[PDB]
Amino acid sequence: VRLAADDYVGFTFFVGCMAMMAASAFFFLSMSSFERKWRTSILVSGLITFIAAVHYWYMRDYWSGFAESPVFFRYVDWVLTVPLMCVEFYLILKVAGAKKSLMWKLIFLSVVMLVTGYFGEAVDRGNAWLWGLFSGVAYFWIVIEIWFGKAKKLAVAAGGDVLAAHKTLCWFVLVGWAIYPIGYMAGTPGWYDSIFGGWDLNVIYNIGDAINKIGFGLVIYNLAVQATNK
Amino acid sequence: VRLAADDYVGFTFFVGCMAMMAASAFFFLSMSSFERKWRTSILVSGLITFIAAVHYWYMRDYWSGFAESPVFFRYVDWVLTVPLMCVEFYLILKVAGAKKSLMWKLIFLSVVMLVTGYFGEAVDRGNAWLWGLFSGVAYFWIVIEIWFGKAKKLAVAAGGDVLAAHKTLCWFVLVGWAIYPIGYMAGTPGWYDSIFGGWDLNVIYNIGDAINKIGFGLVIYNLAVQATNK
Amino acid sequence: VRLAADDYVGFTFFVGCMAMMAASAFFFLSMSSFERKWRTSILVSGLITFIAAVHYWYMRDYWSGFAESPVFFRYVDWVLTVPLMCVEFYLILKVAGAKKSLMWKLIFLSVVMLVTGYFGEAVDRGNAWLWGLFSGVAYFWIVIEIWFGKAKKLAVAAGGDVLAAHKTLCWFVLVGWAIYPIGYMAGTPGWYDSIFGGWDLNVIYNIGDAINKIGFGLVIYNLAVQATNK
Amino acid sequence: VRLAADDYVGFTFFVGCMAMMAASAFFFLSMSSFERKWRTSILVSGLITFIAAVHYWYMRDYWSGFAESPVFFRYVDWVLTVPLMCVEFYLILKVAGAKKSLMWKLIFLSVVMLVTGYFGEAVDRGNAWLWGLFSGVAYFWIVIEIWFGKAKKLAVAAGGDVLAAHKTLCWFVLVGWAIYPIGYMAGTPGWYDSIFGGWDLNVIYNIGDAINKIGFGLVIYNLAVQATNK
Amino acid sequence: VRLAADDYVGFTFFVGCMAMMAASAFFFLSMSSFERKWRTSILVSGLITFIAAVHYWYMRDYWSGFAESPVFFRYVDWVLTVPLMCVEFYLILKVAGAKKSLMWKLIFLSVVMLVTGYFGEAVDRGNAWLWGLFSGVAYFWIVIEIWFGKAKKLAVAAGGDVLAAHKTLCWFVLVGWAIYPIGYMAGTPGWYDSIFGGWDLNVIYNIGDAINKIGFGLVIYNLAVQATNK
Ligand SMILES: CC1=C(/C=C/C(C)=C/C=C/C(C)=C/C=C/C=C(C)/C=C/C=C(C)/C=C/C2=C(C)C[C@H](O)CC2(C)C)C(C)(C)C[C@@H](O)C1
Ligand SMILES: CC1=C(/C=C/C(C)=C/C=C\C(C)=C\C=C\C=C(C)\C=C\C=C(C)\C=C\C2=C(C)C[C@H](O)CC2(C)C)C(C)(C)C[C@@H](O)C1
Ligand SMILES: CC1=C(/C=C/C(C)=C\C=C/C(C)=C/C=C/C=C(C)/C=C/C=C(C)/C=C/C2=C(C)C[C@H](O)CC2(C)C)C(C)(C)C[C@@H](O)C1
Ligand SMILES: CC1=C(\C=C/C(C)=C/C=C/C(C)=C/C=C/C=C(C)/C=C/C=C(C)/C=C/C2=C(C)C[C@H](O)CC2(C)C)C(C)(C)C[C@@H](O)C1
Ligand SMILES: CC1=C(\C=C/C(C)=C\C=C\C(C)=C/C=C/C=C(C)/C=C/C=C(C)/C=C/C2=C(C)C[C@H](O)CC2(C)C)C(C)(C)C[C@@H](O)C1
Ligand SMILES: *C/C=C(C)/C=C/C=C(C)/C=C/C1=C(C)CCCC1(C)C
Ligand SMILES: *C/C=C(C)/C=C/C=C(C)/C=C/C1=C(C)CCCC1(C)C
Ligand SMILES: *C/C=C(C)/C=C/C=C(C)/C=C/C1=C(C)CCCC1(C)C
Ligand SMILES: *C/C=C(C)/C=C/C=C(C)/C=C/C1=C(C)CCCC1(C)C
Ligand SMILES: *C/C=C(C)/C=C/C=C(C)/C=C/C1=C(C)CCCC1(C)C
Ligand SMILES: CCCCCCCCCCCCCCCC
Ligand SMILES: CCCCCCCCCCCCCCCC
Ligand SMILES: CCCCCCCCCCCCCCCC
Ligand SMILES: CCCCCCCCCCCCCCCC
Ligand SMILES: CCCCCCCCCCCCCCCC
Ligand SMILES: CCCCCCCCCCCCCCCC
Ligand SMILES: CCCCCCCCCCCCCCCC
Ligand SMILES: CCCCCCCCCCCCCCCC
Ligand SMILES: CCCCCCCCCCCCCCCC
Ligand SMILES: CCCCCCCCCCCCCCCC
Ligand SMILES: CCCCCCCCCCCCCCCC
Ligand SMILES: CCCCCCCCCCCCCCCC
Ligand SMILES: CCCCCCCCCCCCCCCC
Ligand SMILES: CCCCCCCCCCCC
Ligand SMILES: CCCCCCCCCCCC
Ligand SMILES: CCCCCCCCCCCC
Ligand SMILES: CCCCCCCCCCCC
Ligand SMILES: CCCCCCCCCCCC
Ligand SMILES: CCCCCCCCCCCC
Ligand SMILES: CCCCCCCCCCCC
Ligand SMILES: CCCCCCCCCCCC
Ligand SMILES: CCCCCCCCCCCC
Ligand SMILES: CCCCCCCCCCCC
């Protein structure tokens, strides 16, 4: 329980936990300052930070206890949050004429991706590469859908601020999420051990997680503010 | 109390606890995002997830402590929630002209069913089969009421979206709940030696619980959203 | 702190604690769906469940710790709640032309009753019968006031649903509360034995408490709903 | 950690903690039931109970642990709350037009009083009587200000219910607070040991505290209710 | 874990924690009594106190445990809060025609300052002076920006109460914050050991922190108050 000055992992847990708790409060308490239709999109963003805050709190204690943060445990959060973020694609293009078919697709993809991930990392480590492959494919499909699929066409039709915030999402998916597949390579045996192996990811996980989720949130909030002021 | 990767029960407690906590927040915070008439129906759906979240949190810790989740302890939650879900039949058809008699019936049935269950499982295990039988009968009665009784006739009279959402609820009762009677068979000795597959009932309980209750919620919420936008 | 199936006291603490927490949420979150005048009556009903929920949580832990629930400790809750329920008489007859004098009387009576009770049970057990007697007298006074006193006359003058809900309250006072004086008889030495074998007082306390308080709540809520819809 | 029936200090901590938590909820949840300008006055009353509830909870645990409640520790609460109560003078006479000069004065006086108190009781007990003297002077100043100073003149100018509630506050300051100076006399050596010495105030502290702060609250709330109905 | 009367650090943690928790409640609960536009500025001020309250709670326990408060641990809070205060410049000049470029600048500067601080104090103590220097420069830049830079000119252009509140903030930055750089000097070896060395700042940190943050809050709140009374 004693703190050390050089414990940079410790620090990043405490910061992340605190920043997620603050963000969660910030979206929950901002909900009320918006027009009827936007609220739900904010609300869900809050949820996302909220689940993370509560899980981070747990992890923050665990690391202080045992000085080890097992990667699979993160999945507890990811399997819940990653889908919600996908749902956030529906809420942005709902005004543009998005169909529940898209919703279902996204959720399906996101869940499969995270379950396959979890199987690769926890359940079946011998055959982890294949699970990786499946998850990879589900990721690519999601990234292709959002970049060149129906979602982009709907966004371009809508145009304006709605388009912009879409793109930034896609960047966050493309660049922000990329760190997670990489960490898998460093986590599981296979043909990618040489390229990525032995890297300390905890700090990168703690910073990235907070950035990713708070980032999404701040985008959707930016979209709401730019839509009310004009 | 360090966690292990292969502890799939552990994982499902943490996920279920987090998903129930999120849903509870989601309905509590969405309650205000509808007109006054729907609110109570949402509110109660939230309550359902809320009671589950708080109980799951307790169970989640217990399993982490002693690595055993006694089945009777689940009843703490079920005796409270199963009635509320039944109440949810009344709240949908209240605008269609439902009578409190129906509500009282449902509550009565649901309570008896769960108490009989609890007697079968906790106090009197030798004569568990009879209690089973009584609970069974209470189940059947409720399924007959909702499928062919006055509830569906009132829904059809109202007609449209109110009907649709009703049916899906009946499916959730019919198919969703079916896992609970089965687990009883696997729990008590008698004329049923029902043990099916290598799957651990705890895991099925943790996933099912969350599905069932989050399911309910999503349906009621879907009904409210499709009724307000038009 | 492992639970047993046969620990029926345990079970009733966990259920009671959970049901009180749910009810407290249910009144707090329903408060806002009413006209300005009703709110306070609901709010206070919630407060009542709220104090109980928080105390029950403490008792629930204690019993899990030491497997003994000292009766005097319940008073911590009762001395706070029993007065509020009395206030609930004032809040429903306030529109009928109740005077604050009545409210003060009620509070006074209820406090004296509970303090005398606490003196009987905690400070001097040798003199417990006399304290009993005094508490008894305060009970009778309250029951006579509400059944045949000014409160009934004001309710009958008002008439309608406001009257009805009054009666049911009086039943809850008359029948619901009766279990508490009985338990005293079983708790303290004197001229009364009140064996009441078989049933465990704790269990009757846990179920009764929840019934009494949730009951009150449901009544006041029923009154508000039946008065607002017309 | 085991409870005793004869532990009247224990009891009063648990009651006080619970009653403060209830009141805090009661003002927070009632805040919305008033016109905009009363809200702040309620809010602050709640804050007062809230800080007390949280400190009482801490003290309640401590006493259960070590069976001793050091008087200086209470100051943690008093230094925060006593100023807020003073602010409550400003918020009631905002109708008739009080000047921030009065606000600042009150806060200044109250803080000095409490700091001098803390110095008398914590750092230098040899020099305690002088600190007493200084605190005394700050008290007297406050009591004379509110009884015969500008505050009374403003209240009389305003007249009506606003005046009434003022007086009762002055009584609470005059009579309610008087127990605190006395306790000092019983706590520290000096020239007042003879008059007041060896007295145990814990029980009197626990009851008084709750009375004083819940009292203020009930007054401000009474003022708001009597000002909206007319 | 028993506390002593002369433990002034202890006392200041408990007061700070309590005062921050109260303030956080006070802004969150006041938020709704304002027009749409001001809310966000209050909200964020509350967030600031909120993060501090939760971190102070942790620190408060730590000191009670180990009787030592490591300086680097404070950074957990500062790295989150110091930026938000800077953002508070944007929210007050937003209606005056502030550009997000200014907000980004401020955040950038504040983050750099705090990171450089953290590097100086945690990871690289040998080269702490250079990090100091860099942080210093980031501070100076911020102070010159707010005193003579774009921010001041924008505030003067939109004079009145918005200007006043600006100045006071600058004072709080100039004078309030100054104690943090000083503490660095007392913490790290270099050319400033002679001037500042061996000083105990814990008590000064705890009082300053609460003043600084509650101060900010009270200013923004004051600005909102004198903006509604037209
Ligand atoms: C897990 C696994 C796999 C999966 C692999 C995956 C999913 C690989 C993914 C690779 C990725 C995502 C590569 C990313 C490349 C580049 C990145 C991350 C960043 C580029 C640019 C940056 C950082 C910033 C760009 C800009 C910003 C900041 C915004 C501006 O608007 C535009 C610009 C200046 C360009 C298989 C399927 C291949 C095999 C299996 O056995 C193992
Ligand atoms: C899954 C699904 C479908 C279903 C399709 C089909 C073809 C389903 C066909 C049949 C199914 C799923 C039947 C499941 C039945 C389960 C039941 C009726 C379980 C009842 C258990 C009871 C009443 C146990 C009672 C007892 C107990 C607990 C202990 C006693 O000692 C003994 C006894 C009285 C037997 C679609 C395709 C239609 C729609 C889609 O949305 C959902
Ligand atoms: C109150 C009042 C007044 C009087 C005010 C007085 C007497 C004083 C006011 C302010 C004072 C004394 C402020 C002092 C501020 C000190 C600061 C901001 C110090 C900053 C230090 C830094 C940034 C150090 C950085 C470094 C570090 C940390 C390590 C590196 O290695 C070296 C260095 C770069 C120097 C008037 C007369 C002006 C106006 C009247 O209206 C009111
Ligand atoms: C008569 C009737 C019916 C049929 C039956 C009903 C409703 C019966 C219900 C009876 C019940 C629930 C009676 C319960 C009574 C409990 C009482 C009066 C308990 C009082 C206890 C006290 C006051 C104890 C005090 C003392 C204590 C605690 C210690 C002291 O040392 C001694 C003493 C003063 C006695 C219906 C339902 C058909 C219609 C209805 O309108 C009327
Ligand atoms: C009959 C009647 C009533 C009842 C009571 C009446 C009229 C009076 C009651 C007086 C009471 C209850 C209290 C009097 C209080 C005296 C106080 C507050 C004394 C304060 C003393 C201080 C502050 C001492 C400080 C010092 C310290 C701390 C130690 C130093 O070394 C020396 C010193 C400076 C003296 C009412 C209230 C119902 C109203 C009306 O109906 C008339
Ligand atoms: C807030 C939580 C976030 C954004 C987490 C994201 C995680 C991923 C997108 C994971 C992707 C994976 C693959 C595509 C390949 C390897 C396994 C996974 C599950 C890490
Ligand atoms: C979240 C809680 C839920 C949905 C629990 C559902 C539980 C049941 C519907 C239990 C039913 C039972 C029978 C119909 C027969 C055997 C005994 C029971 C209690 C398991
Ligand atoms: C929420 C809990 C409730 C309603 C408890 C109520 C308890 C009473 C009305 C107790 C009355 C007593 C007497 C009339 C005689 C003996 C002492 C008491 C306090 C048990
Ligand atoms: C709930 C907290 C309350 C109402 C505390 C009030 C305390 C006082 C007004 C204390 C006054 C004192 C003096 C005038 C002299 C001796 C020292 C003090 C601080 C106890
Ligand atoms: C909530 C606490 C606050 C406002 C703290 C702010 C502290 C700073 C602005 C101090 C920064 C420092 C320097 C300019 C020089 C030395 C290193 C720092 C980070 C302590
Ligand atoms: C550290 C986590 C929380 C960070 C929250 C950032 C503060 C929000 C800044 C922009 C707010 C714009 C308000 C728009 C409505 C007028
Ligand atoms: C462990 C470090 C936590 C880092 C917390 C700060 C997160 C801030 C995220 C903001 C980045 C995206 C901004 C969106 C652009 C409008
Ligand atoms: C939308 C959220 C979905 C969350 C799905 C959680 C799945 C967890 C699976 C746990 C292990 C399954 C059995 C392992 C092999 C016996
Ligand atoms: C332990 C694993 C728990 C996983 C729970 C995931 C949340 C369930 C989502 C709801 C599923 C039914 C959808 C009904 C559509 C109206
Ligand atoms: C006003 C229209 C709102 C439509 C929203 C539909 C999607 C909502 C999904 C969020 C529910 C998440 C449940 C908790 C996590 C398992
Ligand atoms: C909404 C109704 C909930 C009712 C909960 C059940 C309470 C009774 C449980 C059984 C108590 C122990 C009985 C022991 C008999 C010897
Ligand atoms: C606007 C009026 C709506 C009335 C709806 C009927 C009320 C039924 C709610 C039942 C709540 C049960 C709470 C149980 C707590 C354990
Ligand atoms: C272990 C105790 C479980 C008790 C659960 C009680 C649930 C609420 C009961 C409500 C009583 C009926 C009130 C009807 C008012 C119109
Ligand atoms: C309306 C609320 C009234 C609350 C009454 C609280 C009861 C206080 C009991 C105090 C008993 C102290 C021990 C006995 C004397 C040594
Ligand atoms: C609009 C009419 C309001 C009437 C309020 C009567 C008193 C309110 C209940 C008691 C206050 C809370 C007590 C908390 C426990 C000490
Ligand atoms: C430890 C015992 C504490 C008991 C707390 C009871 C609540 C105090 C209420 C005081 C009422 C003052 C009069 C209000 C007039 C508007
Ligand atoms: C709309 C009028 C508002 C007037 C506000 C007057 C001052 C309120 C002071 C509140 C201080 C509480 C926070 C600090 C205590 C920890
Ligand atoms: C550990 C010591 C805590 C001290 C609590 C400080 C309370 C707030 C005082 C700051 C005053 C700022 C005035 C702002 C004017 C609008
Ligand atoms: C404009 C889009 C930028 C998104 C970049 C995300 C970077 C996340 C960093 C994760 C590892 C620290
Ligand atoms: C400490 C990190 C704060 C980051 C704030 C981002 C603000 C950008 C969105 C603004 C919407 C108006
Ligand atoms: C439309 C069908 C809804 C019910 C689905 C069945 C859910 C059963 C529980 C799952 C256990 C893994
Ligand atoms: C318009 C309301 C429909 C809500 C459907 C939500 C589907 C479930 C989401 C599960 C996410 C893990
Ligand atoms: C209509 C009146 C009903 C009153 C019910 C009170 C009895 C239940 C509580 C005690 C059970 C042990
Ligand atoms: C408007 C409906 C009147 C209130 C009756 C509610 C009864 C619910 C009892 C729930 C027990 C689980
Ligand atoms: C007219 C108002 C009188 C208020 C008196 C309050 C006295 C509180 C004493 C509590 C200490 C045990
Ligand atoms: C309109 C009535 C306002 C409140 C009056 C004071 C209430 C006193 C309660 C005493 C403790 C329960
Ligand atoms: C507004 C309230 C301020 C309270 C400040 C208390 C300071 C106590 C210092 C004790 C250490 C010597
Ligand atoms: C109007 C000028 C306000 C300046 C505030 C200074 C606060 C100093 C805090 C540090 C005390 C240890």
Residues contacting residue A130 through CB under 8 Å, at least 6 positions apart:
A120
Q: Any idea where the domains of chain A sit in the sequence?
A: 8-228
Nearest to A172 by CA among A85, A76, A90: A85
Sign for the CA dihedral angle at B197, B199, B202, B203 comes to negative
Q: Are the C-beta atoms of A42 and A24 separated by less than 8 Å?
A: no
Mutate to test the pocket of ligand 9, among D73, D80, D113 (most ligand atoms within 8 A of CB): D113
Is E199 buried (19+), middle (13-18) or exposed (0-12) by CB count in 10 A?
exposed
A136/A113 Cα distance (integer angstroms): 7
Residues contacting residue D53 through CB under 8 Å, at least 6 positions apart:
D17, D20, D21, D23, D24
| CA distance readout (Å), C158 to C85, C87, C91, C122, C151 | 20, 18, 13, 43, 11
Fill in the DSSP letter of residue A176: I
Is E97 buried (19+), middle (13-18) or exposed (0-12) by CB count in 10 A?
exposed
Q: Are the C-beta atoms of C83 and C58 separated by less than 8 Å?
A: no
Chains D and B touch each other (3 or more Cβ pairs < 8 A): no
Q: How many helices (H) and strands (E) does chain E have?
A: 9, 0
Q: Are the C-beta atoms of A13 and A199 separated by less than 8 Å?
A: no
B40/C26 Cα distance (integer angstroms): 9
C72/D14 Cα distance (integer angstroms): 12
Would you give the distance in Å from CA C17 to the centre of its chain?
A: 15
Is A42 buried (19+), middle (13-18) or exposed (0-12) by CB count in 10 A?
buried
| CA distance readout (Å), E186 to A217, E9, E180, E183, E193 | 40, 18, 10, 5, 6
Cα-Cα-Cα-Cα dihedral of E16, E18, E22, E24, to 10°?
60
What are φ and ψ of residue E149, in 5° steps?
-90, -155
User: Cβ of A75 under 8 Å from any chain B Cβ?
Assistant: yes
A contact test, residue of B7, B17, B18 with most A CBs within 10 A: B18
Which residue, chain included where needed, has tokens 């005062």?
Answer: E19
CATH architecture of E8-228: Up-down Bundle (1.20)
Residues contacting residue E112 through CB under 8 Å, at least 6 positions apart:
E134, E135, E138
B191/C161 Cα distance (integer angstroms): 53
As a three-state string, the secondary structure of chain D is CCCCCCCHHHHHHHHHHHHHHHHHHHHHHHHHHCCHHHHHHHHHHHHHHHHHHHHHHHHHHHHHHHCCCCHHHHHHHHHHHHHHHHHHHHHHCCCCCCCHHHHHHHHHHHHHHHHHHHHHHHHCCCCHHHHHHHHHHHHHHHHHHHHHCHHHHHHHHHCCHHHHHHHHHHHHHHHHCCHHHHHHHHHCCCCCCCCCCCCCCHHHHHHHHHHHHHHHHHHHHHHHHHHHCC
Among protein residues, the one with the nearest Cα to ligand 21's atom 2 is D207
A39/B29 Cα distance (integer angstroms): 10
Measured between beta carbons, the chain E residues lying within 8 angstroms of D38 are: none
Query: b/e string for C178-202 if b means 16 or more Cβ within 10 A?
Result: ebbbebbbebbebeeeeeeeeeebb
Whether E55 sits inside 8 A of A18 (CB atoms) is yes
Nearest to E17 by CA among E210, E211, E200: E210
What the block records as the tokens of A42 is 């904010």
Which of A39, A46, A75 is the closest to B33 by Cβ?
Answer: A39
Residues contacting residue A8 through CB under 8 Å, at least 6 positions apart:
A203, E122, E123
Q: How far is D33 from chain C (nearest CA, A)?
A: 7
B122/C4 Cα distance (integer angstroms): 9
Is E11 buried (19+), middle (13-18) or exposed (0-12) by CB count in 10 A?
buried
E35/C179 Cα distance (integer angstroms): 53
A168/A92 Cα distance (integer angstroms): 12
Which of A36, A40, A51 is the closest to B22 by Cβ?
Answer: A51
Nearest to C146 by CA among C160, C175, C166: C166
Is C5 in a helix, a strand, or coil?
Answer: coil
Q: Are the C-beta atoms of E85 and A23 separated by less than 8 Å?
A: no
State which residue of chain C sits closest to D25, comparing Cα positions. C47
Size of interface A-E (CB pairs under 8 A): 52
A102/A91 Cα distance (integer angstroms): 11
D44/D59 Cα distance (integer angstroms): 22
Range list of β-strands (E), B38-157: none
User: Cβ of C57 under 8 Å from any chain D Cβ?
Assistant: no
Would you give the distance in Å from CA E38 to the centre of its chain?
A: 21
